[PDB]
Amino acid sequence: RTPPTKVSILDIAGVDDTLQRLLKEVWFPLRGGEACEKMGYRYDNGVLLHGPSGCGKTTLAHAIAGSIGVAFIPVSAPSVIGGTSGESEKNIRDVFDEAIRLAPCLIFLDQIDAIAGRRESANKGMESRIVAEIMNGMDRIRQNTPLGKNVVVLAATNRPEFLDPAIRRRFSVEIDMGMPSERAREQILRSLTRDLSLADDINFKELAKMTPGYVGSDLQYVVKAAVSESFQANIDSLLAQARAKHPVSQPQRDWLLLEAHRDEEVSWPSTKITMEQFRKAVSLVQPASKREGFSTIPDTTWSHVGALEDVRKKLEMSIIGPIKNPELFTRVGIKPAAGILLWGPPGCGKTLVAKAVANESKANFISIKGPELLNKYVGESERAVRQLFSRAKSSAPCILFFDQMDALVPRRDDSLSDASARVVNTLLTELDGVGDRSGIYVIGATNRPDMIDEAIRRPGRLGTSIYVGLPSAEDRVKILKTLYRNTVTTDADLEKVALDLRCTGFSGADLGNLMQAAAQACLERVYTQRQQKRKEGEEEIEPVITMEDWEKALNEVKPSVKDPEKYMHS
Amino acid sequence: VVVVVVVVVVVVVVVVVVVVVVV
Ligand SMILES: Nc1ncnc2c1ncn2[C@@H]1O[C@H](COP(=O)(O)OP(=O)(O)OP(=O)(O)O)[C@@H](O)[C@H]1O
Ligand SMILES: Nc1ncnc2c1ncn2[C@@H]1O[C@H](COP(=O)(O)OP(=O)(O)OP(=O)(O)O)[C@@H](O)[C@H]1O
Ligand SMILES: [Mg+2]
Ligand SMILES: [Mg+2]
């Protein structure tokens, strides 16, 4: 039952405070037995490891179980369950009896919450007698051992709240192995790649900066993904030997050619993993915390956003700046959290510019579609908001975008519904409360900034309000060129179209509609001319928006925001 | 004859709801 020497203390990295504590709370009771016997003190300790799943709790237990060399008893909660009436409780009793008989010994109750769940809620008889048997077992250790040979019980669980309070109190030490920091992620990558061949240009400082929400388990997949990149080129050379061996798309042929050479293998040359592969591996790997609840990064870049230079400078200084280089903004005394409220008339680019920031910052992105978090049950709407900021904090830096936010934070009045007033007060505490949310950047977009609660629109929650209004005559030239060149006439005609007095009051959405109406005028011109050539004598002309088509659109498209001042004020 | 431990079905619960008012 001796611990196998397959996991090494070097295999666990990024945790140093934890390994510093375990040197006096696990190593000393088990290895320094004589020191405890000098004072006649029974130093039987119990250490509970808890944290997010994937934070190397099981590997830490096995790492320190091979670094000590004492008897190790790995226990999995389902393994102590039997079909007989009394066999289930007898198996747990035999575990602690054997540990005392083999003192000094280390018990590892991995996933202890599976069998040691609350007996005050799970009202069964086997389940309650298993919990009571563990308490009795963990107390026999403190008394039945020969004083100088202590027994330490290690338990790991990612749901410490499910434990029975009468059992959770029996673990003197609880260690919270949280998500690794930037310094810790660098050490984990080195310990995961220490047996691999790297191309000597791997900058782990950059790798740690580009993995904001990763845990120890997630970083293993990045190394695992990066390894497959190096061997991707060694499979194409294998497919070439198969494609040229023989005389249904391309992927289907690969699965069939490799099936044919099933009894024959080709040695793969050893290759190093370059920095480009690692940078490519990070994009292919989604963090365990990012699996659900996170929106896909918008495709919009700054090349899609025309004009809005003032808005672009504010969003770069408030969000994109601190995300990319937080060290510079920390020195001047800028908190790593921003609150931006984009507001203005509809169609002027509020959502577009907030989708470029989510894309240019290259950070994690969560998008909320108006009142998307509301639920019919009493507590499920406030719980969704609290869980929303729990994910964002765990994966900082993160950008929270509230599109059409006036439906989620209505101004709190007496006439306001109670169910919609609890969500507002929930957001007040999440944005700025006892638990600071540093690393969460919030963007709000709305047409009615005066309908947002006045407590939200304060610094620390949504500090800055950026007005995104109607473009000027000079701005409409940049926007029309931006819309045209991103969808394919030249540029001299686009300037004439955008500067026309018929485009007075056009918003950003009207210019996009103007281009569509010009394209529709092009198709009518194509349709009529195609029939005339086809019928008279095999007929396909090039569809291109000509200047004559822009004339039809200008006489067809009218502005949509009739009264900008209704949205320009307040 | 040995009696084995057998798992069974679970109980049902109640859920509160919130209802809006147009007035
Ligand atoms: N600090 C770390 N250093 C090195 N590798 C780590 C670290 N943390 C996690 N890993 C890797 O991630 C995996 C950890 O699996 P493990 O069973 O320990 O998960 P866990 O963190 O205990 O979560 P859970 O308790 O939910 O099982 C291993 O592949 C291990 O190499
Ligand atoms: N400055 C701009 N540069 C490029 N395209 C723009 C610009 N302003 C508006 N558009 C076009 O108009 C569309 C309007 O998108 P968006 O969702 O931002 O509207 P909005 O201004 O937020 O109005 P709403 O209040 O209705 O959401 C954009 O997707 C783009 O096609
Ligand atoms: Mg584990
Ligand atoms: Mg919009």
PDB file of C-alpha atoms and ligand atoms in Angstrom, chain A residues 300 303-308 344-355 401 403-404 445-447 468-469 471 475 478-480 482-483 486 507-513, ligand 2:
ATOM      1  CA  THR A 300     -15.660  43.888 -35.328  1.00  0.00           C
ATOM      2  CA  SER A 303     -11.292  48.953 -39.312  1.00  0.00           C
ATOM      3  CA  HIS A 304     -15.081  48.532 -39.090  1.00  0.00           C
ATOM      4  CA  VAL A 305     -15.513  51.697 -36.997  1.00  0.00           C
ATOM      5  CA  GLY A 306     -15.351  54.983 -38.876  1.00  0.00           C
ATOM      6  CA  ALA A 307     -15.086  58.377 -37.185  1.00  0.00           C
ATOM      7  CA  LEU A 308     -15.678  58.212 -33.408  1.00  0.00           C
ATOM      8  CA  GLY A 344     -27.054  58.295 -27.543  1.00  0.00           C
ATOM      9  CA  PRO A 345     -29.535  58.085 -30.394  1.00  0.00           C
ATOM     10  CA  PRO A 346     -30.077  54.652 -31.953  1.00  0.00           C
ATOM     11  CA  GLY A 347     -27.986  53.564 -34.897  1.00  0.00           C
ATOM     12  CA  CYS A 348     -24.971  55.757 -34.140  1.00  0.00           C
ATOM     13  CA  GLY A 349     -22.533  52.976 -33.256  1.00  0.00           C
ATOM     14  CA  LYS A 350     -22.864  52.233 -29.529  1.00  0.00           C
ATOM     15  CA  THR A 351     -22.990  48.460 -29.888  1.00  0.00           C
ATOM     16  CA  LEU A 352     -20.532  48.476 -32.792  1.00  0.00           C
ATOM     17  CA  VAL A 353     -17.822  50.329 -30.878  1.00  0.00           C
ATOM     18  CA  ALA A 354     -18.376  48.139 -27.819  1.00  0.00           C
ATOM     19  CA  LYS A 355     -17.917  45.038 -29.968  1.00  0.00           C
ATOM     20  CA  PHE A 401     -21.316  44.421 -21.955  1.00  0.00           C
ATOM     21  CA  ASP A 403     -26.698  45.995 -24.389  1.00  0.00           C
ATOM     22  CA  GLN A 404     -29.855  48.069 -23.902  1.00  0.00           C
ATOM     23  CA  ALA A 445     -25.208  50.769 -24.049  1.00  0.00           C
ATOM     24  CA  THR A 446     -28.593  52.468 -23.935  1.00  0.00           C
ATOM     25  CA  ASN A 447     -30.737  55.032 -25.708  1.00  0.00           C
ATOM     26  CA  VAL A 468     -22.249  58.715 -29.223  1.00  0.00           C
ATOM     27  CA  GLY A 469     -24.241  61.200 -31.273  1.00  0.00           C
ATOM     28  CA  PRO A 471     -21.975  62.083 -37.173  1.00  0.00           C
ATOM     29  CA  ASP A 475     -17.605  62.171 -40.097  1.00  0.00           C
ATOM     30  CA  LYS A 478     -15.277  58.464 -43.008  1.00  0.00           C
ATOM     31  CA  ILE A 479     -18.249  56.283 -42.085  1.00  0.00           C
ATOM     32  CA  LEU A 480     -19.474  55.852 -45.652  1.00  0.00           C
ATOM     33  CA  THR A 482     -15.685  52.591 -43.868  1.00  0.00           C
ATOM     34  CA  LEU A 483     -18.984  50.908 -44.712  1.00  0.00           C
ATOM     35  CA  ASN A 486     -15.663  46.798 -45.587  1.00  0.00           C
ATOM     36  CA  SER A 507     -27.135  58.393 -38.641  1.00  0.00           C
ATOM     37  CA  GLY A 508     -24.623  55.571 -38.787  1.00  0.00           C
ATOM     38  CA  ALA A 509     -27.424  53.094 -39.437  1.00  0.00           C
ATOM     39  CA  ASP A 510     -28.840  55.197 -42.285  1.00  0.00           C
ATOM     40  CA  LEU A 511     -25.492  55.287 -44.082  1.00  0.00           C
ATOM     41  CA  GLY A 512     -25.412  51.496 -43.926  1.00  0.00           C
ATOM     42  CA  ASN A 513     -28.964  51.482 -45.285  1.00  0.00           C
TER      43      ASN A 513
HETATM   44  N1  LIG C   2     -19.194  54.974 -36.785  1.00  0.00           N
HETATM   45  C1  LIG C   2     -19.617  53.934 -37.504  1.00  0.00           C
HETATM   46  N2  LIG C   2     -18.726  53.274 -38.270  1.00  0.00           N
HETATM   47  C2  LIG C   2     -19.151  52.232 -38.993  1.00  0.00           C
HETATM   48  N3  LIG C   2     -20.371  51.711 -39.084  1.00  0.00           N
HETATM   49  C3  LIG C   2     -21.233  52.389 -38.308  1.00  0.00           C
HETATM   50  C4  LIG C   2     -20.945  53.481 -37.511  1.00  0.00           C
HETATM   51  N4  LIG C   2     -22.083  53.923 -36.854  1.00  0.00           N
HETATM   52  C5  LIG C   2     -23.018  53.101 -37.261  1.00  0.00           C
HETATM   53  N5  LIG C   2     -22.575  52.148 -38.141  1.00  0.00           N
HETATM   54  C6  LIG C   2     -23.380  51.090 -38.784  1.00  0.00           C
HETATM   55  O1  LIG C   2     -24.650  51.074 -38.175  1.00  0.00           O
HETATM   56  C7  LIG C   2     -24.814  49.865 -37.391  1.00  0.00           C
HETATM   57  C8  LIG C   2     -25.451  50.204 -36.073  1.00  0.00           C
HETATM   58  O2  LIG C   2     -24.957  49.317 -35.073  1.00  0.00           O
HETATM   59  P1  LIG C   2     -25.248  49.545 -33.508  1.00  0.00           P
HETATM   60  O3  LIG C   2     -25.807  48.306 -32.915  1.00  0.00           O
HETATM   61  O4  LIG C   2     -24.057  50.154 -32.884  1.00  0.00           O
HETATM   62  O5  LIG C   2     -26.346  50.683 -33.473  1.00  0.00           O
HETATM   63  P2  LIG C   2     -26.470  51.709 -32.243  1.00  0.00           P
HETATM   64  O6  LIG C   2     -25.739  52.921 -32.678  1.00  0.00           O
HETATM   65  O7  LIG C   2     -26.035  51.015 -31.011  1.00  0.00           O
HETATM   66  O8  LIG C   2     -28.035  51.975 -32.070  1.00  0.00           O
HETATM   67  P3  LIG C   2     -29.088  51.201 -31.111  1.00  0.00           P
HETATM   68  O9  LIG C   2     -29.358  52.187 -30.007  1.00  0.00           O
HETATM   69  O10 LIG C   2     -30.298  50.987 -31.971  1.00  0.00           O
HETATM   70  O11 LIG C   2     -28.451  49.927 -30.633  1.00  0.00           O
HETATM   71  C9  LIG C   2     -23.420  49.265 -37.297  1.00  0.00           C
HETATM   72  O12 LIG C   2     -23.455  47.861 -37.139  1.00  0.00           O
HETATM   73  C10 LIG C   2     -22.783  49.697 -38.610  1.00  0.00           C
HETATM   74  O13 LIG C   2     -23.285  48.873 -39.650  1.00  0.00           O
END
